[PDB]
Design a protein around this ligand. Structure first.
Ligand SMILES: *[C@@H]1O[C@H](CO)[C@@H](O[C@@H]2O[C@H](CO)[C@@H](O[C@@H]3O[C@H](CO[C@H]4O[C@H](CO)[C@@H](O)[C@H](O)[C@@H]4O)[C@@H](O)[C@H](O[C@H]4O[C@H](CO)[C@@H](O)[C@H](O)[C@@H]4O)[C@@H]3O)[C@H](O)[C@H]2NC(C)=O)[C@H](O)[C@H]1NC(C)=O
Ligand SMILES: *[C@@H]1O[C@H](CO)[C@@H](O[C@@H]2O[C@H](CO)[C@@H](O[C@@H]3O[C@H](CO)[C@@H](O)[C@H](O)[C@@H]3O)[C@H](O)[C@H]2NC(C)=O)[C@H](O)[C@H]1NC(C)=O
Ligand SMILES: *[C@@H]1O[C@H](CO)[C@@H](O[C@@H]2O[C@H](CO)[C@@H](O[C@@H]3O[C@H](CO)[C@@H](O)[C@H](O)[C@@H]3O)[C@H](O)[C@H]2NC(C)=O)[C@H](O)[C@H]1NC(C)=O
Ligand SMILES: *[C@@H]1O[C@H](CO)[C@@H](O[C@@H]2O[C@H](CO)[C@@H](O)[C@H](O)[C@H]2NC(C)=O)[C@H](O)[C@H]1NC(C)=O
Ligand SMILES: *[C@@H]1O[C@H](CO)[C@@H](O[C@@H]2O[C@H](CO)[C@@H](O)[C@H](O)[C@H]2NC(C)=O)[C@H](O)[C@H]1NC(C)=O
Ligand SMILES: O=C(Nc1ccc(Br)cn1)[C@@H]1CCCNC1
Lengths: 205, 205, 205, 205, 205
């Protein structure tokens, strides 16, 4: 791509990926969603769950926009996430770092809309004593920004599915639910939005 | 030697390896193939398979071509893959990152034809309940680009091998098959090509 | 952030993050505290404890201050800890490196006050023979600077918590305590401050 | 000291360590040899062997030569292998990456002769069903260049050792042998040299 | 603070940390010593020992000296070891890389005297068949430079400790000893100094 190469040359000018791309008094809105793909194992003694999940993040970076008439054919581009601002979201339940299974790339369109969809292997903390009963075991997965409050980063959920769930795993799903919440912590005087996914599962036999 | 060093100096000028090397409305065609070398282990409880496979990728980068009369004796060069555009292909079944066994190098000829043949240790998801029966257990390995559609990256399969398979492993092969598929998904208005390899194997005793 | 981007450009000028930001004959005061989140496992044979703990560090870097009238709306900024001076604190009991669960980011306000709150998975050495008794097993966690004495880095403790402790872990807490200590060795004429947190716990069965 | 520092400044000028240092129609000859230090474990079920081996590589880089009269006292220098051209040799039997135990440094003399002697922990594939018999189990270790043919990189073996072998390991050696081989495939018109070491060992009980 | 920042700016000028800081025909003398902190585990089948040890290295770098009258108050500085020349010492018995537990920092005074005291978790090879007897099991730990001979790097031992040994480990110490040696080998025409520490220990039950 000749035009793509000219575009990347224009896009890098003055762009600093350590700065959140806010504007006037508008936050950056980040749409967040999840697909549970597989439950791999449960550690009943240490109260741990091992999963593969597919995170889905979307936002708008007003510094990454261009005139599509000026760069013809260049509808959307594939950029390594390392060279963009990325929201600093994390799973509060985790007891190990995430292992990232997908390429570390994001899609960007001409509006400056960004899409980043990492698939991750993750172990996390949960009371799983009921996993071998009819009613099963329920676990929470709280996600949110580490350093940014509502007025800087507006976290917003989108609807999940379980169409990706694996049929041949020895755990079946009894229920899922999701909820956006906004809260105060003692630390900080502003409010912090989180998105929490709840999964009830159990052993098949 | 001397000429190769002058060549690398000319090739780096203006080359950006984060940009796919397309032109007008010609995709980059990537020829993709595979050799299964060994099945290392199977986890019957967690439904996982552990393998060593030898991936074979070939494409053409019109920015990596040179006049062989200007660089005499320089027929082909050995370049670290880190300094080229590389196709963003992945195994959709994987539940861990790949462990790469080979040097991270590619061969490039004077036309700009590129060749990259990584050998990989990889664990992936498969229903292997039938692995201890006469008919055995069948597993799929779906490969494809993470961000690029047909009009940008034309995935094309080539005929695969089991001539390298290991005789002393405790699993025998009952059959293999391979299939290219092209599909439309709700997400995107363009089509996405994948290449899928299917292996049926079973335990010897 | 337009102003944030201008600010980072001014803050990097002459900043060297390998130099401790002392001034005249004032040390850098570092306020240090902790929250115990979970006891994951105990190795009775090897005398090891596995935990998740949330460290809380605060200090002031007089090179990171700015006039808020010059950078309007810029109250506080989110910076990667890699590009600041960071205190060289460690856990003297540790027998493995720390696994850092949180994003490696710190908050900085317009005074130059810095805040860094890593959450960590850590294995460490402790006599845990009494863990299966009524009175239980007591373990110490000694923290302090590796290279800096009191006149350069003034370590100060703050009151630690167990409000985050996990209810479903198979260990219950019998008590906690904390103590700052300042000490001389024959070697060196200056004193060295440490902060030590003590936890008594036991097995629920 | 002073002269070594001046020498490194002159040696880096125009040196590109991604280019093989060939000349006219002379390959780079690489002398390759090995010492088996210890057999650590054998996995009879998965057909794997775990070893520590000491590789010994020597070659000549005509770009790394200097006049010893101009740099007096500077007979040989210790350089990090990362800043030289290194041959792209690998073990074809390996099923995991190598764990390098030694410092990543090479010795260079005033002729431009280079010496690099990494010691490595390595797991590899071998039929070890006979390991518990009188005649024992034989395993091959095939080494060679990944991208370079005979006219570019002349692989040459040298006589190997077992004088370093550990007496207290539970495996004894019944024999070793070594062989250089040169081979054609239909694909490619140039020949490819490998060096293979064969070890027969058995369990002492 | 201000003066330290000016000093680091002057010290980096012309400093190349890949070059050993020798002078005329004076080697760099490196004083080396050790404290055994804990024996963590023993593998009786594979003949391996797991330890934590505290290495103590001191030398003089005549390029890192400054006039204390010119940089008032600047008695000593804390520098990351990555930006200095460091001696290339290793443990010849090791079968895994070292896990470094301490911050990677060294102390430097105005004379150019350097101090670097890494604490390390390390597994190594030893005959430990006698570990369950009255007389116990003896193991050697040979340290020395990988690339430097006596005329460049003069290794010198200093008297070691067991005052830091852990009382609650299930191994007790029966004795320690230490010895500096200098040798010629066929390889090399110059002599090579090593420092070896011997530890006899046994199981308490
Ligand atoms: C960046 O973020 C930091 C992090 O806290 C802020 O720093 C604090 O700022 C506050 C607000 O100005 C300071 O508050 C003052 O603290 C002083 C503390 O010192 C005394 O008290 C304790 C004893 O318990 C000891 O630390 C010390 O030895 C002293 O004895 C007080 O002197 C002040 O009290 C006075 O002010 C109040 C107003 O709040 C008056 O109403 C009272 O009458 C009284 O006169 C006050 O409490 C605090 O010092 C700072 N803390 C730290 C840790 O630095 C920065 O302010 C913030 N950036 C910006 C721009 O605000
Ligand atoms: C860059 O990508 C973004 C994300 O796909 C595009 O934004 C989307 O734009 C469309 C039309 O502008 C929006 O569709 C409308 O949605 C509402 C309901 O949500 C509905 O009432 C309308 O009838 C219509 O369906 C869509 O909401 C919007 N989504 C987001 C998250 O912004 C954008 O158009 C792309 N840019 C270019 C130049 O193609
Ligand atoms: C730089 O280092 C290299 C190390 O290899 C030196 O090269 C080799 O030096 C040896 C010295 O023994 C030469 O050996 C010769 O080999 C025959 C063996 O049949 C022997 O009979 C001769 O008497 C002689 O010793 C060898 O020629 C040479 N390497 C090769 C590939 O031929 C080199 O000398 C060093 N240079 C300097 C200036 O230090
Ligand atoms: C660069 O490599 C390409 C691909 O290997 C070469 O093109 C092939 O050459 C063979 C000759 O045996 C043809 O039959 C194939 O059809 C070609 N393949 C493709 C995919 O085009 C080409 O010859 C090489 N370049 C040079 C200058 O020799
Ligand atoms: C820099 O540090 C070295 C390391 O200790 C100091 O040298 C030692 O100082 C004592 C006390 O005078 C002597 O008895 C030792 O023999 C010295 N040398 C060594 C190699 O241990 C040195 O004095 C310090 N320099 C300054 C200017 O403070
Ligand atoms: O022990 C305290 N804090 C503390 C100490 C260690 C740990 Br772990 C957790 N919390 C006291 C508790 C009562 C109030 N003052 C601090």
């Amino acid at each position: 791509g000749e035009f793509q190469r000219k575009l990347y040359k224009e896009l890098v000018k003055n762009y600093n990926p350590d700065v959140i791309p806010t504007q006037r008094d508008r936050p950056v809105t980040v749409y967040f969603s999840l697909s549970l793909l597989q439950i791999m194992d449960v550690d009943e003694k240490n109260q741990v769950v091992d999963v593969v999940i597919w995170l889905q993040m979307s936002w708008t970076d007003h510094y990454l926009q261009w005139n599509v008439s000026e760069y013809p054919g260049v509808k959307q581009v594939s950029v390594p996430i390392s060279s963009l601002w990325k929201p600093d979201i994390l799973l509060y339940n985790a007891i190990e770092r995430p292992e990232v299974l997908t390429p570390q790339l994001a899609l960007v369109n001409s509006s400056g809309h960004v899409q980043y969809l990492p698939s991750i292997r993750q172990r996390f903390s949960c009371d799983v004593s009921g996993v071998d009963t009819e009613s099963g075991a329920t676990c929470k997965l709280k996600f949110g920004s580490w350093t940014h409050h509502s007025r800087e980063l507006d976290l917003q959920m989108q609807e999940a599915d379980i169409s990706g769930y694996i049929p041949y795993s020895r755990f079946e799903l009894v229920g899922v639910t999701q909820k956006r919440s906004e809260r105060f912590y003692e630390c900080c005087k502003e409010p912090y939005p989180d998105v929490t996914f709840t999964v009830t599962f159990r052993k098949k036999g």
